[PDB]
RNA sequence: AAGCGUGUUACCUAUACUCUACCGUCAGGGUUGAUAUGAUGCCCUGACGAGUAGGCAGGCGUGGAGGUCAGUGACGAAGCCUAGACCGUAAGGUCGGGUCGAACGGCCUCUAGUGCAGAUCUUGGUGGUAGUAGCAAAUAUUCAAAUGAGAACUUUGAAG
RNA sequence: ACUAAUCGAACCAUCUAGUAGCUGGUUCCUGCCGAAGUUUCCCUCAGGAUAGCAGAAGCUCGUAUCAGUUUUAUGAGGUA
RNA sequence: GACGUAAGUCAAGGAUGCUGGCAUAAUGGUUAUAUGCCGCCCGUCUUGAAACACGGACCAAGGAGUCUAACGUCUAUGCGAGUGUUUGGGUGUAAAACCCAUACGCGUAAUGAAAGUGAACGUAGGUUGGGGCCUCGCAAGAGGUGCACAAUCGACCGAU
RNA sequence: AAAUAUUGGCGAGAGACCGAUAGCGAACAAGUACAGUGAUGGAAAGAUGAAAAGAACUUUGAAAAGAGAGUGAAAAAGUACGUGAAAUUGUUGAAAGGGAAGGGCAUUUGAUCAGACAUGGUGUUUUGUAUUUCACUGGCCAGCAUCAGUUUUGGUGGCA
């Protein structure tokens, strides 16, 4: 609201918090990113380094559906199983009946390896897996089989 | 009557009249701080008007106390007044301006019967 | 006039009360003000101070951080106190039996603690049993892990993230960041 | 309501005062004031009258009477600050003064009804003055010009300065 | 010397120094086993207090909104005037008196087209100048009567 | 020169509330703190950015890893 | 604390005792005036304004840091590895309120120009400091633990 | 076709909007009066009272109008009409005035204004038992005494 603005506190004081000498004007320094290479160079090198230039190639008509690849680490791998049955599979780690974690149905494209899943085998259907994640699933006894 | 109080010392009794309120009719007597870059009143030159300072603040024990020694309490009806039944030694009721003359005689009826001082018992009389 | 070596009327710069109007927070401050004043324990002063802290300065302490704390030898049965919230953590799977005293408990953390046999007490239920903080253990969440902090103190070669909203290529990867274009920060 | 309420009403109780440590010590009179000296009254109806200082009353006042036959000043109490002591002294060892006390001079008990809205002398107040000044005047007559001295008032004739003047 | 040089004291007075009271800010503290209107309160101790640009904080005020005081009011709301009073350091509030005629307050919040001495500010109005400058080119008017309340100015007549 | 009292580019309406690093103004009170006119860069010198000075928010702690200071010891200078 | 054998008293953590007058314009207040001393005309630009710098004849009303999109720090709140109902649907006493699915945004992973790859040797490390806690300890203090945080060497992931 | 747009037209409902210098330029015979050759530009101006009940009649005046009476609750509502501010003006009253005036501190003098305490009151035999018929105080201003704090000015004493 406006009744708390300093503008209401600045009533009476001649310059409205903007200075006698400076004389708050329209646009003393330019407009927008103006003079970024000329008189705002220090600002655009201290706080925005890398602002000016042409790095990289150009991907014409990039579609982010191609680059959709949300990554699920191993610590979160056990979040996909519903909480109701999570305990029932943590206990009595069964090689002959292993839980299947369909990360794709849960909205993840790749499995990463942030590490330390419990020693219980899981069948992990996923599009992609990192080397370390694959070796950690095997170490726990599960398997990762690829899908699309 | 009223509880003992230290002798009232206002520490400044002249009202702070805005600088040049006399000179210009457009400048009202209400106090405004002179925020000029050159005003002698702001700079506290000798021989110029005193400005309100927190030094002039009255004693805490005697703030909002009338010269009689009561905190005035603006009262509208009998119900508002009967909240001073157990505070008569400090609060002196004051009948609001908009209370009709017929309703005043009943307000002072209770105030007299309760021993509560009224700051304006003579307003809107019938005579 | 005197030689003012330092600033006059300099406020202590520390919160003396919650900035909030949360009355239940003000009751805990009221109780722990009494305890801080009337007890010898330096624990209640820390809790009283910590209750004043703001939301960024009261970061979530996950049950994992408590579980990490309970691994300290001699601190197995110590009661854990978090002046803040406790958010559950999926990274761990087993939670050691304990009691945790905290302001707020996310529903996930409450489930995770009580299934471990824990007792999610509040800071009043703390002060009832342990006014001086007997075998207590105060934990704090990672304060400088806030995302707003990585942009603090940015400058040339300060190794800090720029305030950029649209991260990617062609956004702050140019002259002033690689040798091939201009210089390096 | 015209005004809402004060939530922290002042306590009605009137506070009992502290035990002040101010005892009432006896007054130490000036060395110049001795029973029998002559005082020049400075204030009152009898300002400038020469009187005789008789006794030091317990109310810090001085019981004095320039004998009523001499200057017409009755037995009265005065204030030791509103008199000037003087070198000259009379001997009043033989005059009864011990019967004069504060309860003797008490004017009257005043009430709200007995008020002089618009507007004598006691026989004891005359007899006692007589039985006092009998000794005083009998003593006075053995020295020259003292009775005339007491009768004649005091005034600061121009040119003199009391700072360089001694009595 | 009431000049110059010098010295001895005495004396004068700053918003300075000391002490006291009060205000405020800051700081450090005390204050909850049937005792306190239940603590951003109360109290104790101490130090501080200049200020533009500027920053923050606590408040005052205006138009409207929610709630509430079963609020005020034609027995007089609002408004306005008041060398009449009271409170507040102040913004301001309150009351009395006159005018007036129909609505308007207090408090807890919300909200904004929210506070004026300025801008050669805008609009409106009114002043001093001031009963002043001015009503001085075109040669020029005058007498009487008539009408009329009233005739330098109208009518007619006669002159010019 | 003149082109409707307008002329080295008429008048009217609109884009238009054109832009102005320039001028003027910028509306209540009190309390607390309280500067700068310097660095570097800029078609920069009536202006900006930047560091500096300032306020606020605080935060981690509680007499210290301190100081517009001296002393002792030890350097350094090349002015008078 | 003093005097006191002690009882007590006391100039010892701040004025009590007695006396008088008046009880109202007496004291006090406001206001006008006189006097003594002081006081330059405000706003603004400015190193510097009473300026022979500019604006201001006066008065009433109007009159100037607003709203939005996107953000930054900070504060509060709700939830919290999640979070966000209000695009929309159902509903409704009907622009309110209530309820809700899927998505989608941001976050949970980074790095590289890109192809791509994608975070535990270790009790998620060692060291130094570290509030707090625990033990011993009349008590200082000594040990163990040591969150956040600060520094530093690591370790891991991306790029070269 | 529908989902979509819609500051125009017609109708309708609403409002945390403006409230007659605002809101449309236009609350009223407003795109009107008026200005411009023209394209165009373009105002101001709301409210008597419930009802004209809009002042019959008398008198002065040429008349306007005045004074009466009269309506009306009010004419301090008379169509120059709700309220009626300030600038400015008149009159009356008060005060002051030797090239300004105005202001500050203090007081004089004048004018004018609030407060007590004059308390159920330390009580006192109800004319067929709640008026305590002599009340305690402090209200305003002073004096003395004994003290305390800060200080000032002396006079003497002992000693080094």
Swiss-Prot record, chain A:
SUPFAM superfamilies: Ribosomal proteins L15p and L18e
Pfam families: Ribosomal_L27A
Bias-annotated ranges (Basic residues): 1-13, 20-29
GO molecular function: RNA binding; structural constituent of ribosome
Main location: cytoplasm
Compartment(s) where it occurs, according to its Swiss-Prot or TrEMBL record: Cytoplasm
A biological process from GO: cytoplasmic translation
InterPro entries the UniProt entry points to: Ribosomal_uL15, Ribosomal_uL15/eL18, Ribosomal_uL15/eL18_sf, Ribosomal_uL15_CS
SUBUNIT field: Component of the large ribosomal subunit (LSU). Mature yeast ribosomes consist of a small (40S) and a large (60S) subunit. The 40S small subunit contains 1 molecule of ribosomal RNA (18S rRNA) and 33 different proteins (encoded by 57 genes). The large 60S subunit contains 3 rRNA molecules (25S, 5.8S and 5S rRNA) and 46 different proteins (encoded by 81 genes).
Cross-referenced PANTHER family: 60S RIBOSOMAL PROTEIN L27A, LARGE RIBOSOMAL SUBUNIT PROTEIN UL15
Record protein name field: Large ribosomal subunit protein uL15
Annotated organism of origin: Saccharomyces cerevisiae (strain ATCC 204508 / S288c)
From Swiss-Prot, chain C:
Gene3D superfamilies: 3.100.10.10
Modified residues (N6,N6,N6-trimethyllysine): 49
Example GO biological process: cytoplasmic translation
GO molecular function: RNA binding; structural constituent of ribosome
One cellular component term from this protein's GO annotations in UniProt: cytosolic large ribosomal subunit
Keyword hit for Ribonucleoprotein: yes
Superkingdom of source: Eukaryota
Principal subcellular localisation of the protein: cytoplasm
SS bonds (residue pairs): none
Cell compartment(s), UniProt: Cytoplasm
Keywords per UniProt: Cytoplasm, Isopeptide bond, Methylation, Ribonucleoprotein, Ribosomal protein, Ubl conjugation
A Pfam short name: Ribosomal_L18
Crosslinked residue numbers (Glycyl lysine isopeptide (Lys-Gly) (interchain with G-Cter in ubiquitin)): 115
Miscellaneous comment in the UniProt entry for this protein: There are 2 genes for eL18 in yeast.
Family statement: Belongs to the eukaryotic ribosomal protein eL18 family.
Subunit structure: Component of the large ribosomal subunit (LSU). Mature yeast ribosomes consist of a small (40S) and a large (60S) subunit. The 40S small subunit contains 1 molecule of ribosomal RNA (18S rRNA) and 33 different proteins (encoded by 57 genes). The large 60S subunit contains 3 rRNA molecules (25S, 5.8S and 5S rRNA) and 46 different proteins (encoded by 81 genes). eL18 interacts with NAP1.
Function recorded in the entry: Component of the ribosome, a large ribonucleoprotein complex responsible for the synthesis of proteins in the cell. The small ribosomal subunit (SSU) binds messenger RNAs (mRNAs) and translates the encoded message by selecting cognate aminoacyl-transfer RNA (tRNA) molecules. The large subunit (LSU) contains the ribosomal catalytic site termed the peptidyl transferase center (PTC), which catalyzes the formation of peptide bonds, thereby polymerizing the amino acids delivered by tRNAs into a polypeptide chain.
Name of the protein in its database record: Large ribosomal subunit protein eL18A
Organism: Saccharomyces cerevisiae (strain ATCC 204508 / S288c) (Baker's yeast)
Curated annotation (Swiss-Prot), chain D:
Function: Component of the ribosome, a large ribonucleoprotein complex responsible for the synthesis of proteins in the cell. The small ribosomal subunit (SSU) binds messenger RNAs (mRNAs) and translates the encoded message by selecting cognate aminoacyl-transfer RNA (tRNA) molecules. The large subunit (LSU) contains the ribosomal catalytic site termed the peptidyl transferase center (PTC), which catalyzes the formation of peptide bonds, thereby polymerizing the amino acids delivered by tRNAs into a polypeptide chain.
Protein name: Large ribosomal subunit protein eL6A
Record's comment on post-translational modification: N-terminally acetylated by acetyltransferase NatA.
UniProt keyword list: Acetylation, Cytoplasm, Isopeptide bond, Phosphoprotein, Ribonucleoprotein, Ribosomal protein, Ubl conjugation
GO biological process: cytoplasmic translation; ribosomal large subunit assembly
Oligomer and partners: Component of the large ribosomal subunit (LSU). Mature yeast ribosomes consist of a small (40S) and a large (60S) subunit. The 40S small subunit contains 1 molecule of ribosomal RNA (18S rRNA) and 33 different proteins (encoded by 57 genes). The large 60S subunit contains 3 rRNA molecules (25S, 5.8S and 5S rRNA) and 46 different proteins (encoded by 81 genes).
Superkingdom of the source species: Eukaryota
Modified residues (N-acetylserine): 1
UniProt keyword tRNA processing present: no
InterPro entries per the UniProt record, alphabetical: 60S_ribosomal_eL6 (IPR000915), Rib_uL2_dom2 (IPR014722), Ribosomal_eL6_CS (IPR049633), Ribosomal_eL6_KOW (IPR041997), Translation_prot_SH3-like_sf (IPR008991)
GO cellular component: cytosol; cytosolic large ribosomal subunit
PROSITE patterns reported for this sequence: RIBOSOMAL_L6E
């Amino acid at each position: 609201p406006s009744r708390f603005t300093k503008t209401r506190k600045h009533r009476g004081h001649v310059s409205a918090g903007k200075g006698r000498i400076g004389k708050h004007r329209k646009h003393p320094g330019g407009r927008g990113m103006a003079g970024g290479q000329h008189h705002h160079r220090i600002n655009m090198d201290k706080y925005h380094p890398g602002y000016f230039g042409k790095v990289g190639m150009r991907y014409f008509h990039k579609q982010q559906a191609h680059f959709w690849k949300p990554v699920l680490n191993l610590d979160k791998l056990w979040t996909l199983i519903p909480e109701d049955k999570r305990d029932q599979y943590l206990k009595s780690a069964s090689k002959e009946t292993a839980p299947v974690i369909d990360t794709l149905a849960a909205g993840y494209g790749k499995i990463l390896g942030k590490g330390r899943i419990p020693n219980v085998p899981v069948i992990v259907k996923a599009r992609f897996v990192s080397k370390l994640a694959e070796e950690k699933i095997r170490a726990a006894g599960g398997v990762v089989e690829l899908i699309a | 009557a009223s509880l003992p109080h230290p002798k009232i010392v206002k520490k400044h009794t002249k009202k702070f009249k805005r600088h040049h309120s006399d000179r210009y009719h457009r400048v009202a007597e209400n106090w405004r701080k002179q925020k000029g870059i050159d005003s002698v009143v702001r700079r506290r030159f000798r021989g110029n008007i005193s400005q309100p300072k927190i030094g002039y603040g009255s004693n805490k024990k005697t703030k909002f106390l009338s010269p009689s020694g009561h905190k005035t309490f603006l009262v509208a009806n009998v119900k508002d007044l009967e909240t001073l039944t157990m505070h008569t030694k400090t609060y002196a009721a004051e009948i609001a301006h908009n209370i009709s003359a017929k309703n005043r005689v009943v307000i002072l009826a209770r105030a007299k019967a309760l021993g509560i001082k009224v700051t304006n018992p003579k307003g809107r009389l019938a005579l | 006039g005197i030689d003012h070596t330092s600033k006059q009327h300099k406020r202590s710069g520390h919160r003396t009360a919650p900035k909030s109007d949360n009355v239940y927070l003000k009751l805990l401050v009221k109780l722990y003000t009494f305890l801080a004043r009337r007890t010898d324990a330096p624990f209640n002063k820390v809790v009283l101070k910590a209750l004043f802290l703001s939301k960024i300065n009261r970061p979530p302490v996950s049950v994992s951080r408590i579980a990490r704390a309970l691994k300290q030898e001699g601190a197995a049965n110590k009661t854990v106190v978090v002046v803040g919230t406790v958010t559950d953590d999926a990274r761990i799977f087993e939670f050691p039996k304990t009691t945790v005293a905290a302001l707020r408990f996310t529903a996930g953390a409450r489930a995770k603690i009580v299934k471990a046999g824990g007792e999610c007490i509040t800071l009043d239920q703390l002060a009832v049993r342990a006014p001086k903080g007997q075998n207590t253990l105060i934990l704090r969440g990672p304060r400088n892990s806030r995302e707003a902090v990585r942009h603090f103190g940015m400058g040339p070669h300060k190794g800090k993230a720029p305030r950029i909203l649209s991260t990617g290529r062609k956004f702050e990867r140019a002259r002033g960041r690689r040798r091939s274009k201009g210089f390096k920060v | 309501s015209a005004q809402k309420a004060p939530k922290w009403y002042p306590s009605e109780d009137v506070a009992a005062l502290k035990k002040t440590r101010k005892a009432a010590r006896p007054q130490k009179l000036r060395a110049s004031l001795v029973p029998g000296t002559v005082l020049i009254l400075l204030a009152g109806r009898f300002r400038g009258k020469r009187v005789v200082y008789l006794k030091h009353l317990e109310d810090n006042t001085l019981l004095i009477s320039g004998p009523f036959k001499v200057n017409g000043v009755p037995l009265r109490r005065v204030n030791a600050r509103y008199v000037i002591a003087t070198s000259t002294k009379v001997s009043v060892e033989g005059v009864n003064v011990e019967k004069f006390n504060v309860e003797y001079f008490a004017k009257e008990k005043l009430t709200k009804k007995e008020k002089k809205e618009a507007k004598e002398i006691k026989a004891e107040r005359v007899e006692d003055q007589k039985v006092v000044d009998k000794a005083l005047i009998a003593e006075i007559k053995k020295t020259p010009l003292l009775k005339q001295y007491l009768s004649a008032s005091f005034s600061l004739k121009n040119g003199d300065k009391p700072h360089m003047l001694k009595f």
